[PDB]
Design a binder for this molecule. Sequence first.
Ligand SMILES: CCC(O)(O)CCCCC[C@H](NC(=O)[C@H]1CC12CCN(C)CC2)c1nc(-c2ccc3nc(C)ccc3c2)c[nH]1
Ligand SMILES: [Ca+2]
Ligand SMILES: [Ca+2]
Ligand SMILES: [Zn+2]
Length: 368
Amino acid sequence: GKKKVCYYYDGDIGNYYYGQGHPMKPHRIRMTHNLLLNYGLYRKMEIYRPHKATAEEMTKYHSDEYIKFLRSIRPDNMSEYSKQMQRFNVGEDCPVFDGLFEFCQLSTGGSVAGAVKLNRQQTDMAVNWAGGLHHAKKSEASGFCYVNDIVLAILELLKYHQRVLYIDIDIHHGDGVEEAFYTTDRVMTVSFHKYGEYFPGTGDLRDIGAGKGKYYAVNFPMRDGIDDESYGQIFKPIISKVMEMYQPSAVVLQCGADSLSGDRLGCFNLTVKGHAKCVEVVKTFNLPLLMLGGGGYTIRNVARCWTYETAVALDCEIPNELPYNDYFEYFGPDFKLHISPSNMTNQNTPEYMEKIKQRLFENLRMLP
Ligand SMILES: CCC(O)(O)CCCCC[C@H](NC(=O)[C@H]1CC12CCN(C)CC2)c1nc(-c2ccc3nc(C)ccc3c2)c[nH]1
Ligand SMILES: [Ca+2]
Ligand SMILES: [Ca+2]
Ligand SMILES: [Zn+2]
């Protein structure tokens, strides 16, 4: 039936700025919030302002030196940290910007607070669109991510859940999360991503985990142009088999919107309905679920996507005609919620999709 949904948002999140020309735009979180408020989606959700996660909470995964660096570096003192900046990969993709640490604290706070709420059985679903920063490593920033809120949220869920399933539908491989849990069977990581001449270069079909974690990392490598039909045909069968074999007690779903058609950095062809079908599939298993954001670089489409996925979480039908909102002009020329796919060729033939699915099924047969 219909579930209780808790949503995490801090009104200051949209003011963090990565710099001119940087594709990562925290303002998309504020556009999402304003659109979902104007659709009236606040009437059915408990809205919470996340606390600022402490350096101590972040060191449950990240190194003390790395978190100390993030808490200390500022654009005005960067000159004195050239050595640490290289060591921690702070540069073009992961720049130093005003309020960087506070941005990490808010992104992380939402994810950890959502995990605590789920652990206490006070909600069925927890949503943090500011989270899902899946590339951050133990002592290194990567791919616009500095603190891995997902790993921290999973560590929190592991306090009450023996097995946690992580699913990542961002176009980029969820490498930081996969790496963090690569040698354990208490987390199964499943990533669907573009693979081949594409960041971060990891997520081959043959990367399946190591030691006690062997068979607990699942990667579905895809080519350009995947559409709703093709994605839908492999997502539900894979997730159903993973649910059957692994029997997780909690799920974390990274909803990176850069897998949508027309994304500035992505080359997939999903519509908002095709992307949201993943949320519908996961929600059907009736397990405690933490829904997170991630990529998404055509910001009007990210706001549409996450507003629709919040409506999906709430089992609320919302009209295609967009309500008036603070960013109404960004949704022209149509002013509709749903998007059309492009004429791009789907390089993922039906035979390729079935072959990769069958290889993943062989690996899933190896679970106990
Ligand atoms: C939030 C989750 C997520 O969606 O998975 C994150 C995606 C991260 C993508 C990172 C990717 N990085 C890369 O491909 C790494 C090899 C390089 C080195 C750095 N240059 C700037 C780009 C090539 C990349 N970087 C860019 C890019 C494009 C334009 C930029 N423009 C500016 C001004 C600054 C940084 C810029 C970075 C595109 N692709
Ligand atoms: Ca992914
Ligand atoms: Ca694992
Ligand atoms: Zn991405």
